[PDB]
Each structure stands twice: as structure tokens, then as C-alpha cells.
Ligand binder design. Sequence first.
Ligand SMILES: C[C@H]1CC(C)(C)N(C(=O)CN2C(=O)c3ccccc3C2=O)c2ccccc21
Ligand SMILES: C[C@H]1CC(C)(C)N(C(=O)CN2C(=O)c3ccccc3C2=O)c2ccccc21
Ligand SMILES: C[C@H]1CC(C)(C)N(C(=O)CN2C(=O)c3ccccc3C2=O)c2ccccc21
Ligand SMILES: C[C@H]1CC(C)(C)N(C(=O)CN2C(=O)c3ccccc3C2=O)c2ccccc21
Lengths: 475, 475, 475, 475
Amino acid sequence: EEDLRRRLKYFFMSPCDKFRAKGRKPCKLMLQVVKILVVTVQLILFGLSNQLAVTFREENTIAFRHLFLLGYSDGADDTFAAYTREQLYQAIFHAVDQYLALPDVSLGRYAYVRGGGDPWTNGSGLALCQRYYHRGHVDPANDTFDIDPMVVTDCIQVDPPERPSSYKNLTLKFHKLVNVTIHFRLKTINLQSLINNEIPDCYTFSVLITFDNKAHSGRIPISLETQAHIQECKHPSVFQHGDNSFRLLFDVVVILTCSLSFLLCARSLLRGFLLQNEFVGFMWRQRGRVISLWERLEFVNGWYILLVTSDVLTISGTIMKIGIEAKNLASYDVCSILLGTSTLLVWVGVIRYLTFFHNYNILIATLRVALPSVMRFCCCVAVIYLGYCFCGWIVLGPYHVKFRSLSMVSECLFSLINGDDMFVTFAAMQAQQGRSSLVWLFSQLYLYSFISLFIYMVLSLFIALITGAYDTIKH
Amino acid sequence: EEDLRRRLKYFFMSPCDKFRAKGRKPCKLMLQVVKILVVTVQLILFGLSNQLAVTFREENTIAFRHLFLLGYSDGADDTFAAYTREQLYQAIFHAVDQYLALPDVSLGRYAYVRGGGDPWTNGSGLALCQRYYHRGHVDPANDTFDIDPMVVTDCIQVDPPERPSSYKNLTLKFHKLVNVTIHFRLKTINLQSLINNEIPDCYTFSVLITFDNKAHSGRIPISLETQAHIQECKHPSVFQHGDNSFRLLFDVVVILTCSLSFLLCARSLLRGFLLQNEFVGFMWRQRGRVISLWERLEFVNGWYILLVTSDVLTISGTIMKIGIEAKNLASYDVCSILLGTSTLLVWVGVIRYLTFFHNYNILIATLRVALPSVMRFCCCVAVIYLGYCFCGWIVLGPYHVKFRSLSMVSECLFSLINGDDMFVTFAAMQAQQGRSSLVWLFSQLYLYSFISLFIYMVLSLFIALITGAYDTIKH
Amino acid sequence: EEDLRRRLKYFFMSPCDKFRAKGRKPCKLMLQVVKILVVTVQLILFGLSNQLAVTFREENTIAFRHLFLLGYSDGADDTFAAYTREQLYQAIFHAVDQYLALPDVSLGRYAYVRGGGDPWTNGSGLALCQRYYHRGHVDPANDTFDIDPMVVTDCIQVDPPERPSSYKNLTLKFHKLVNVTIHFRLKTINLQSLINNEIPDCYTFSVLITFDNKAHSGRIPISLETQAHIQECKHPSVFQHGDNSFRLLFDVVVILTCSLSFLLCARSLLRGFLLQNEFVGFMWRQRGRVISLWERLEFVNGWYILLVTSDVLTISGTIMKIGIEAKNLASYDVCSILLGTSTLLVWVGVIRYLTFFHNYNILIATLRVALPSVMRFCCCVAVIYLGYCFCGWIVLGPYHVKFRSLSMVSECLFSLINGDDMFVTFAAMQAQQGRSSLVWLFSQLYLYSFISLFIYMVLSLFIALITGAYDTIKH
Amino acid sequence: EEDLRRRLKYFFMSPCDKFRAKGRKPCKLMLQVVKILVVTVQLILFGLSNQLAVTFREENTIAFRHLFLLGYSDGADDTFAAYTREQLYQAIFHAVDQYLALPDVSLGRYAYVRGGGDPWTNGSGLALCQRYYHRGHVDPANDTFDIDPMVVTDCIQVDPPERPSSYKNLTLKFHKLVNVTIHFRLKTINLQSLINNEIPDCYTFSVLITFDNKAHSGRIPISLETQAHIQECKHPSVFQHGDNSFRLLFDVVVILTCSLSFLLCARSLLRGFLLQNEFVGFMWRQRGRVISLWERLEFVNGWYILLVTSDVLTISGTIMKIGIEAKNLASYDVCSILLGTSTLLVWVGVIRYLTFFHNYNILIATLRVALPSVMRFCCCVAVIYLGYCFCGWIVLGPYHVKFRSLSMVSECLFSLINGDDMFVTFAAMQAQQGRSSLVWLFSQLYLYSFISLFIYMVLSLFIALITGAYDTIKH
Ligand SMILES: C[C@H]1CC(C)(C)N(C(=O)CN2C(=O)c3ccccc3C2=O)c2ccccc21
Ligand SMILES: C[C@H]1CC(C)(C)N(C(=O)CN2C(=O)c3ccccc3C2=O)c2ccccc21
Ligand SMILES: C[C@H]1CC(C)(C)N(C(=O)CN2C(=O)c3ccccc3C2=O)c2ccccc21
Ligand SMILES: C[C@H]1CC(C)(C)N(C(=O)CN2C(=O)c3ccccc3C2=O)c2ccccc21
């Protein structure tokens, strides 16, 4: 600490006094400032392209309910179920002929696929497919049942008529059926070339309609699910790259300011490699047992790891982004996360340069000194939260509605310790007030015991653990 | 305390130092650790069987609305009410003929019951039953009314036609009717042998449809309620016990690790029987008046009573669980509570072994020293909560909706002191702004006075009583 | 204070030590204990009678929508509005003939009224009544309009046919109409003699159906409102007073225990009349200027005024209650408040006898010493709450929905400072995002400024004002 | 401070002692008191006129759905969309003929416009207008597409028949269409002369109905939007200004009490001009460096700037208000804000005269001394709030519903840090549990990380920063 002190003096300056103590320009700092205004614009200019490309996937699904399902209304997609025998027939037949008579009745200008896949042959594109147990004979009240699990794949195909059948001959064997599925495809031309302002892309759907019976109980859920798939196409349209060469040059400007940002922040951390061996030569281990590496973690540059973490995930989006043009990758998911997560790390990086004004120093530093004592209390409670979910996850599983699945129960109790959807979870049990009247006696004790523990006893400590950390640090 | 001290020294060790001070293995401890991973799997492997067996009870009820009720739509089951004279007829007749013409129109493969019960004879299975006052003659505006309570059980039965009537002759006497009920049964074969992967069970319903009039006011609620009943049946199906003998052997492994857990925890408490008489021989009652038995309650092993409480309720489920196979008991309720409650006591048992790290010692111990002062404040408030329900329980009883029943009001105010369903309870009165305008003047003062008392005055003490207990114990 | 001290010593005893210091029995106390178990049963035994007598008023209103309104469905009673010209006709005509053809089509056994009132004559019971401006002639785009306010009461009556017309000749003058109303009555026999178990009462409705146009804007709200009126009737039914003489004798037992309760509590306060003049003779005003009468308010018996307030309102219900039998009063409102409010004052009277255990003494007494400082802060805020309602009450009046009326806005902001119906009040403006786009710019600043003031700045003082009162009183 | 002290002594008196130390009447004060009772009545007497004049704009929009849209029901205005080819036709044709056959079928007494505007000619008033790409030819699966953006304005007009066509010849070219719009107008006479009690105004609508397709995806949203426009008209009606000259004279009384209020409050601040130069002559800058102008901001009259701000905005409403009579301005928006904002500043002006009672002095002054330390903490958090919106604003943009637009996300998170609409935002993702299953893995971490930061860590400091300011100021 004779000559190390002035060498370590530069290692904990402010940004402001160091500029006057040495005289080197804050471009090493202010590149962080401009890349805020870079990447935020990069997100929103991605955001106009994404928000269009999902509504095209969305609206064509909403449309295909109102073409291929008899008597569909909006809203409930689960209550739509066929009960009678003939409504299973009529929903099938009303789904078949719309596929047959499509371009005379539809608006949207679609085209048939002429497939060759594995639930297809060559020539046909639609396929309805019965599924039932091969070897079996069941009867109640004179009880005998063979439930030999073996499908009977009766994929009775049908071709489309193109240009200006025996599916009527159909039986279903309702005592034995498992499910009836219907596969086909349609091609389309997406036509949302407003914000691109030029060349669009050319998409391909695949529609499944399922008359499922995994219940054998007299109710058949009727569903529609799609997947959209994308490829490229040949255009005669005119004057593409006008402002559209400018976005590509702009993404270079995006990848300009991040490129040198990786270099200097590593070079700033490279100084730590040059200082960590000098400290050990404090009179050539005259003490020696200072070294325990957690005190060296303060000697490690702290929040510089955050900026370099933001920077790697930043360039991983823009590299992935320019695959929108002529690469087979067009899944906008991984562009959304990587340009979504990296923007979250940029804005929190400015916090480090916010804590040098003294009335900003002493407030966020409370979160630094509390989080050791926070994490140690937190493991006491999180046993009990997890230990309390597994009771209601099967006990109040089917009887309730919002305690059905795996992760929704983990949402439901944690939503209930703040005060939203609390009374409705009380009220939904009371239709079972006499029906399974023992279980309502348990659920009423289940929710009364719970929030009396977390809200009225635990979270009061969770205030007083943070109130202390502000209290100790201001004196 | 000469030789007692080292004998009592072992009585408040940590688990860790005792292993090195004597040298006996922590299998006495770690059986608690593995039975976490036992019973939690036992719950979820019960959970796949239960969640299927209620949806079969659920979906067949949802189906039987859409067969036996004219013009039923989903959602509201209470607003469905017949007002005219003939809609009482048409709903009956549309309920009758579906029972007659069932297997030609339904999917689900049911069978008739050919009953012999007390609202039955032998031969018929359906019975509609008028109910009215025997001796009476009423007339408004020339006022005379005999309301002699005496049923007229006119159970006009009807048989089913099985294999490839005068209920039309029916009058109801609408000025005198009480209610019209309809009883029948149906058998079924549950066919959810996916997760069993082999042999299913064979069920039996009983359906009641009630055209109730306990109002005599021109509206007839129409309802449907079932009960499911289970027995066994003879199977030709093949290769049952493949992985299904393995679950039975697994339940022995469940009842393995709990069996010895009862033994050793009692033996640990058996040491207390060997130490409680030695302490009294502290120089042969040289003091004597130490003994007041609450100080002996700390000398009582504290949380060991919790594990033995968890263990007895654990084996009471698995014994009850193996009655799924070939015992007449099949009510999954008491298996759900006992494998539900015992799992809640397991996870909280680990808390005891969590409080020996010193920053875990001093946080949950606050709840120990506060709960005396908590319980004493709590009896002051809970008089007022109960003393405030009984006002609104009949005053705002019929005028409101969510203040109707007994226990829902106890839910409603306690939901209202946190902040869910608060504004809607204000808003529902304002349709009675002129109609009974005095009562809305009371309800507006009812809810304004209330949360100004509990939220703004009482619960602030309920924070400051717990904040103190953290404050005193950290110095 | 020589001989006054022992005389004032009895004036602040506990209840417990005074029983041993003098030896007089606690029947003076325990009558408060038993009247808890009296009046609470009196409320609930009133509650079975009230909850039936409103559902009869309720269900007959719900029924008369489904008879007299064309195409009514449940739920919305405001959106039901006739737009076309002929749907005003068809709803009238479908309301007329149901009144004509009632007993052949209805269940409920009603009877016609044969009225003689002021919008009636003798002979007819139904009356439809046009209302329009007498002297006027309006025309847009060649603009001239006389809006002389003068009704034209064209009450075209019609009689009913009783026992086994020219309303068709009707024009309405749609350019000039104000509203069309329809009056009639029906009698009934309430038949809910289950919990009385004997003699019922005989009721009378009056139904108004209004085709209002206070808008002249092309939409006519269609409404139905009733009033129920009660009188008595002659019965042939048998064995009335079996357990029904027992309730009358029970109400004497109710008015037994309250009667002497007024006497002794006044006599306890009568001691204060005997002590207030003795204190002034403290050495014959040797000081004199002690007397300022607020220190005498502690010398006033404090919570004894509460019991006597509960007692007067208690007997005012039971006196009012026995008018159910044979008095013209049958309005259950004032029985509901007076047996509702008096029960609230009984349970809070027990609190006084709860604060002598020392860990109960020092907790509710905080509310005593804080409420001076509470009320003084409270007048600072309640200016601002009232000063903030009047902005949104007309500015966000019609544009919103839940800021419409007078007192609902006073509900709405106070519901919004806790956290229910908060986001929906934000979201409802965004349909006016472009339509009146200036006003949404104001509402977004209206709700952002507000809860940032009360929740984040004011209510934090409202915790710290109560936390102090617990803090000062425990040292 | 020799003679300045008594001169500055008057500068910080109370209002009460100054009245006795000099003897000048508090009319200088009490004009603030009466203008509370002035302007509040002025708001509400404006409020009766405004609340009528928007319902006339409201109800005629609600009516025109039920005339011009086939099969419209109430509630959802977005789900109403035509899917088939002919339902686009039938909704157009059912919109056309109602415009043709209006006065025989409607109630409301409208009149046609006989327009001459830019999407009009002279003679016709209705115009339907196709819009499609001029030069283009598209085809999927043999891919070629020309998307040359050029409208084809085929506004096929049509006249009305007035007094007692070839739009049938119509094709739409569905493969090429952009949108179909329909313009017309209607005049009306508002007839809500109840609270004016005399002369009404004469209005003019303009209705647009849009069959938009900015999607080209097989769904056409169908919408209706209006704008109301007002002018004046000639009346024969009688006895106008009875109480209506009295309101005009009352607005002078409103502008009376505000007029002198500007004068004296400025004159009170004019004293500051007479005192600010005297203080500098404190022994002719014997110190001099006191002067830093923030200490002079306390020497600036503080809350007097608030009253003069309220007063200027007060007269700007009433001047704007009397343009209701005979000026072309009739937009009630700017009267609503200026009579809405100025009332908010009046009631908060009374607060200054509330803080001289000593238990009122020391409570609101906490907000004065905290707000420096509040604002400095607040800029640390508001970076993170804004830095966290931009992630979810495009990532959870289309996948969610309530994260769609720009400013609703800013509402949504801030609604979520208090506890309303919290669980529903969790639950809406789980329909995408398998569909884009990666993104739900991100949203579940998005909302778990968030409120664990603001609610459980940040806002606890936000209590402890205000609790301190009450704590320091009371000692
Ligand atoms: C979110 C944070 C805040 C804290 C301490 C108040 N807290 C709880 O209130 C209860 N709680 C769980 O039992 C839990 C388990 C798994 C995920 C999230 C949670 C969860 O919210 C908790 C507990 C464990 C881990 C994290 C937390
Ligand atoms: C749940 C616990 C928490 C505490 C103290 C805050 N608290 C209340 O806020 C009000 N309150 C009752 O009047 C009450 C009565 C019966 C069951 C549950 C409750 C109930 O929640 C209360 C009062 C009595 C007994 C338990 C409690
Ligand atoms: C209910 C009590 C609690 C307290 C102090 C927190 N508080 C408010 O938060 C705001 N507030 C009003 O401006 C107000 C005005 C009229 C009736 C009720 C209220 C009302 O709740 C308030 C203010 C004035 C009078 C009473 C109260
Ligand atoms: C309303 C006030 C209260 C305070 C401090 C608790 N607080 C927040 O909790 C979070 N927060 C924002 O990130 C934010 C950004 C823009 C407008 C409003 C807000 C906003 O409410 C905040 C933060 C920044 C500016 C004002 C505020």
C-alpha cells in the first residue's frame, strides 16, 4: 500500500473526478448512453414487423372456426361439444364440403396443397381418419369387456376438384371409437406489405380438427389447431430496397456500437488481470492469509459483467434478425427473447452510473446489504409454499377449476397472497356445499389457515427485514 | 445439575455436534429426508388415478343436461326455469322420450336398470311423481285457503322397451302442485384404462330431475343432480399386473419407511420418560416448587409430536388406498384428505432441522414468541367480526346476492378486508337506489364504517405487534 | 379525598375485586351475557320470516318479465330496447293479450283487480296511456319547432273478460310522443307457510311497464317495476298456534331481559348523579378551577351509554315485530334495521368487560388515545377527497360508466385506493382513444396523480400515526 | 433586522393574530371561502347541461348499430365480422335499403342531407366506395404477385327518394379488395329542453361504416363511427329567458368574485416586490453572500401562486361557457377541463389556511420535507419501470391481449404492482402452454421476477422513506 495505494486509488474513483485527475475523454462511458438510443429503436423497429406477422397467424385461425365448425360462436372454444349421434355426423359433413366448395364461398384466395405426406397419398389432400380398438366387445350389466389397445387407421382419403364421393358411405362404430381427426393444408400469400412497404412473404398452414373421445362418456370435444409454415416466392413487384436498404445499413449501425462495447469493457476488466497479482505482492505475503477470494470479489469489477452479458445477447439478435430476408429461419421467437432480454439488461446498466450522487448512493445500496439476509429467510418460507401446493394440487384438483394444472396452482396461491381472485376461489366451492360436503369442510380450512400464515405472519417479517436495512445504513 | 448437566447436555445438542460427540449415524435423521421423496410421489401417483375418476363423474353430468333438458345452454344452471304452462309439459315430455329412445340417439353405450326400489316397482325403471296437497281449495280476492300438508304420491311408472303409454294421459293440477320429480338409473362401463393401463371399473349412476315449486309464485326451477355408485365386474381382458404389481410393491415401500419412523420417534420421546423423573431428584426436592409443568413443556420434546401425527395419518391413507382393488370402499375422499393432510405435515417437519443455522434460528423464532401476544389481541377483534356478520346476514340477506347463505358472509367480509370483490359489493346495491331507498342508506354506512375500522385501525396494530417481536429478539 | 377516596375507590374497581370487596352477586353483570344469547336468536328467528317474504316479492317480478315482454332474456334489463316502429307495437300487443289470456296460460293462480283508482275508472283494470305534446309541429332542415309542454292523457282503458277491442284501433304519433305507460294490478295468495308452519298472508301487486322516451333519439327503454302491498284474509285452515303461541311467549322473554336491563344500567348511572355534587365539595371549592367538565367526562360513566342505546333500539323492534300478526304495518324494513343495529351494539358492549386482563387492557386503549390525533389528520385529507370527486363527477361523467351517478363516484375512488376495480377503470377509457382524444389525455393524468397522492404519500402517514400510538403506550 | 424585523414580523403572522395586531377585515381572506360555494355550483350547473348533450351523441350511435348492421347484438363490437362471401353482400344491402326506406321504418324523425362534399356530388347523399389495387395479379402455389399500391375510387353514388338502382349491379373483386366504406349524413333536432327548460339546439351527424380488410386473411371487421356537428336554427317556441336570463346574470356573479380575487392576491404578492429590495439593504451588503435566491424562494409567497393559477383558468371557462348561446363554438371539452381543473385547485387552496392549528401544522409539512428525498429515490426506480415496459411491449405484445397497445402496458404493470388484474394476466398465457411453449416459459419468469422486485423490495423502502419524515419532524 506504499505505491499500491495510488495505483488502487484509480480503481475506486468516481467517473467525474477521474476525468479531471487524468484527462481522458468519456467516450469510454458515453457509448453506453448512445446504445440505449440504439437498441431501443432496434426493438421497436423489430416490433412493427413482429406484431403484423402474428396477427396473420391469429386471424386465419379465428376465421377457420367460422368456416369449418357448425354453429360455432365466439368466446368459448371448450364448451363446443357434440352430444347426439347425428351432430357428430353433421359437423363432419359440414367440415368436408366447405373444403370441397372453398373458393366459391370464401374470401381470402387460398389454394389446395396436393400432398404426399405420411397421413396422405399422392392425389388427395384431405383425410378423415377413424380410430378404434381392433379386438374387443363390451357390454354393461352383463359385464364383459376387451380393451385391447390397437388402432384401426381407416384414413379414407379424398381429393379436391380443382378447376372450372364415398365419404358419404361412412360408419363410425360408436361403441368402439377413440377419436376422429381430419388433416389438410392450405397455402396463402401474406399481404401485409405496408410497413415493409415492399416485398412480402408466402405462407403455408396445416389445419387439424379433432373429434376427440378420451372419455367414452358421451361428450366429444371439437377443436381446431393450426401451425403456420413459411417459405419464399418469386415476385414481379417493383422498387423494393428504397428505405429497405436503409434498415440493413441501420442494423450495421446497431452492430457498430455494440462491437466496440465488448472490446473496451473487456479491456477495463483486463486491468483486473493486471492488478490481481500485484496485490498479492503486498510485501511478498507478509500477511498472506488475507486471500480468501470473496474480498477479491469486491476487487472483481462488479457490474461490468452485466454489460458484457447484455452485449453478447445483443448481437445474437441482429445476426438472427437478418435471417428474415433470405434464410430458412423465420421463427420470430428467438429474435423476440434476445432483443427482449438484452434491452432489459441495458436499462439496468445505467443504475451503476446513477449511484454516485450521495442521495442516490445510500438507497439502492440497501438492497445490496439486505439480500444476504433476505435469501436466508426466503428458504424458510419457500419450503412451506412448495409444501402447501402439493396438498391442493390433487385434493382441490378436479373439484375446482383454477387448481387444475401443474403450474397454475403455483400461480394461484401466489396470486392469492396479494388480493386478486381471492373471493371467487372461495365462492366456487359452494356449488359443492352438499355434493362432497366433506371436501368443502376441508377447503374452507385450507384457505383460512393459509393467508393467516403468509400475509398476517410471514410478510410482516418481510417488511421488517427490509426496514432494518434502511435503518442501519442511514446511521 | 452435577451429573444431570452432562446428561441434559445431550438433550439440547445440535444434530451436527452430537454426531461427533458420540458417533452414531444420522439414519435416525435421514429417514425423514427420504420419506419426503416417498410420500410426495405417493400423492402424485394417487393423483393420476383420482383426477380421471372425477371427470368421469363430471362429464356424464354435463352430458345429461344436453339430453334431458329442453333448450339448455351452458353456463347458467339456475336461470333455466319454465314459466308458461306448456313449457312445464314440453320439458317433461322431452325428458321422457329421450329415456325411451336412448340407445338409438346417444353415444356412450348405456343400459337400463330394471329396478325394484322404494320409488319403484319391478318392471319399470322411470317414475315421474306428482306431489300436491291432499285436502285444500284456494282462491284469491274471495279469500279462502286450506293448506293441509299431505302429499299425494302419484308415481305413474313406465317401463323401457328393450330390444330390436298413458303418461300422455297426464294432468298436473297447477293450482295445488308442490313439485314434480323424475327418478331413473343408468349403468356404465368406465373406460379410462390408460394410466391403470389395464383393468377398469364398472359404475352406476342415479339421476334426479326436479321441477320444484316451493314458491307458488309462477317460476319453476329445473335441475339435474346425480350420484355415482361403483361395483366390480368380470373381465376377459389380458395381461393385467405388468407394471401394476409394481405399484402394489411400491406401496409396501411407502409403508416401509413410515413403519420404522413411528418406532424411533417414539423411542426418542421415550427418552423423555427416562429423564422426567431424574430431574425431580435434583437433590431430592431441595427446591421442589420449580415444578409447574409448563417449564416441563419445554422439557417435553416439542416438534416430535408433529412427525408422529404425520405418520399415523400417512399409513391411514395407504391402507385405505389398497381398497381401490377389490374392496367395496371406493370413495376417494378420505384417501384425498389423509394423503393430502399428511403431506402438509411432512414438509413443515423439515423446518425444525432448518433452525440451527444462526441466521435461520432468529427469524422463525419470532413467530414462537409473538403468538402468545398475537392470540390475546386476536380474541378482541374476532368478537367484532362475528358481531358484525350477524347484522348483514339477514339485513343484507336477500337484497344482495353474495350475502345470501351462512358461511359465504363469513367469506365475504374477510375477502373485503384485503381488497378483492370490494367495489362490486358497493355497486350491486345501486339497483335498489329508489326501491327500498332506506336500506341502501344503511348499506352505504355499513361498508364505510367497517373497513375504516379493520383495515385502517385494527390491522395497523397487527403489523406493529409483529414488528415488535422481530425488534426485541434481534437485540 | 379524605373520605371521598374510599368512596371513589369503588368507582374504578374491576368487576372481579368488587365482588369480593363487598359481596353482591354478578347478576347485575350477567344479564348482559344472556341477552347476547337472547337477541341473536331473536334476529335469526326473524331472519327465516324475512328471507321468505322478499323472495316472494322477488320471484314474481322475475316472472313478469318472462310473460309481459317480447323476447326478454335474463341478465340485461337495460339493453332491452325497441328500435323499429313495429317492435314498439308488437311489445305492446304482446303485453296486452297476456293480460287478457292470463289464467289459461299462467301458473300461479292470479285474479283481476276491477279497479277504481285515478288512472282508472270502474269496470276496467288495464290502462295504456299515450303522452305527447299538445301544441307543436317540428321539422329538421327547414327548421321550426314548438315544444309546448302539455300532456295529452289518452288513457284508453280496457276491461278483462272474467269467466267461462278497440285497443287495436291505435295510433301513437311517433314524432310527438313522450312515453307510453301501462298500469294494472293482480292479487295473490302467498303460500310460504312452511316456517310459520301455519297461517300465511295475502298480497297485492301493482305492475308498471314503461316505454319511455326522454331522449327523442330513436331508442326506447322498456322497463318493468312493481310494488307489493299486503292485507289480511279469512282462513278455514286448521291448528294454528301450536308452536306459534310459543314464539309470542318467547318475544315476551326477549322483552323480559331487556326490560330490567334499562333499569339497572340507569341506576348505575344514577350513582353518577349522587357523586358529581360530592366531588365539588372537595373542601368547599378550595381549588374550584379543576371544574372544566371534560375531566368530568371521564367521571361520566363511559360505555354505559352504549348499552342503554342498544336497549331502547332493542324493544323498538320487538314492539314493531308483533305487528306482523294483525296490524296494518307489515314493512319489514324498520324491523330489519332496529333488530340489525341493536345486535351490533350488543356485541361491542362486551368489549368493555374484555379490557381488564392486562394484555387486553393495553391494545384497544391505543385506539382510544389515537383517535384525537386521527380525527385531526383526517380533516386534512377529506377536503381533498371531496375536492377531487367533483372534478371527475361531471368531466368523466358520461364518458365513463362507473362515474355516472352521485354516490357511485364516492364509492369508486375509495374503492380505487385499495386495489379493486382499478385496471378496468383505466381500460374503459381506451375505446375513446381517438374519439375525444383530449379527454383521455386528461383521465390518464387524473388517475396517475391520484393514487400517487393517497396511497403512496397519505396512507403511509396513516400507518405511522397509529404505529406511534402503540409505541408510546407500551413504555 | 433593526427595523426590518418588525417589518418582516408581519410577513409571517398567522391570519388570526394579524387581524388583532392591525385591525383590517378578513374580506381579503373570506373571498376564497365564498368562491368555493360559487365555482362548485358553477360546475354542477354546467354538469346538467353537459351530461344531456353527450347522451344524445351516445344513444344515436347505439341506435344506428341496430338499424344498419345485419344481426348485430349488444356488447361485442369487434367480434362482429363477416366471413363468407355473401354475408359481405347482405350486410351491405341491408345497410343500403334502410337508408332508402328510413322514415317509414324509423322513430326519431330524421331528414336527408342532399350533400355536395368531396366524396359526394350534388344530388346524392349516400356513397359506397370500393378500394383495390390498380395493377396486380396474385396467385399462390404458382407464385407471382403485383402489389402496386394504387386505389381505384369507384364511388358509386345513390340519391334518396324523398316524398310521398344500379347498386344491385355490383361486383367487388374479392381477390384484390382493400376496404369498402359508406358515407352519408343525417340531420336532427335535439329535444332535451328539460333543464334548459326552453330553446334547444339543432344537430347534424355523419356516419361511416367500414368493411375493412387490412389483413387479406379471410375476416372483415365491420364498424360504425360517427361525428356530431352542431349549428343553430329558427324557433317559434315561447317564453324563453324566464329563469334563463337568471343563469346569465349568475355567471356574472361567478365572474364577479373571481375578478377581484386576481387583484388582491397580486397585490399581496406586490408586497414581495416592495420587500425584496429592502432585505438586500441589510447594512448595505455587510454580508452580501446570503443571496442565493433559494432562501428567497421561501421569501417568495408560496401558495399564492396556486390561487392565481386557479383564477385565470376559472374565467377561461365562463368566457368559454357563454359561447353555448350564439357562438359557433359548442365543443364542451374545453369547458369541461377548465371548469374541471380550476375546481381542483380551489379546494387544495384551503389547505394553506388549514395549517395553523398546531396539530395540523406538523402533518402535511412532512410531505414538504420528504418530497426532496422522495424525488431523488423516484428517479432510480422510474428508469427500471420504463426499462421493463419495452420488453413486454413487443414480446408479450400480440400473444397477450392487455399488453397490446402503447399506453395500456404502462397501465398494466402499474395496475399489477397493487393487486388488481393480476391473476388473469397469469392465466391468459396458459392457452399458449404448448403453442409457442418457449414464450410461456419466458412470461412466467417475467411476472415472477417483476413484483418480487417492486412490491417486495422497492416499495418497502418507499414506506420507510416517508415513515422517517414523520419520525424526524415530531422531535
Ligand atoms: C418471490 C419470493 C418472495 C417471497 C419471499 C415473499 N416468497 C413467497 O411469498 C412464496 N413463494 C413460494 O413459496 C414460492 C415457490 C416457488 C416460486 C415462487 C414462490 C413464492 O413467491 C418466496 C418464497 C420462495 C422463493 C421466492 C419467493
Ligand atoms: C384469521 C385471523 C386474523 C385476524 C386477527 C387479523 N382476524 C380478522 O381479521 C377478522 N376475522 C374474524 O373476526 C374471524 C372470525 C371467524 C373466522 C375468521 C375470522 C377473521 O379473519 C381474526 C379474528 C379472529 C380469529 C382469527 C383471525
Ligand atoms: C374513511 C376515512 C379514512 C381515511 C382517513 C383514510 N380517509 C380517506 O382515505 C378518503 N376519504 C374521503 O376523502 C372521504 C369523504 C367522504 C366519505 C369517505 C371518505 C374517504 O374514505 C377519510 C377521509 C375523510 C373522512 C373519513 C375518512
Ligand atoms: C407514480 C410514482 C410512484 C413510484 C415511485 C412508487 N413509482 C412506481 O412504482 C413505478 N412507475 C414507473 O416506473 C413509472 C413510469 C412512468 C409513469 C408512472 C410510473 C410508475 O408509477 C414511480 C416511478 C417513476 C415516476 C413516478 C412514480
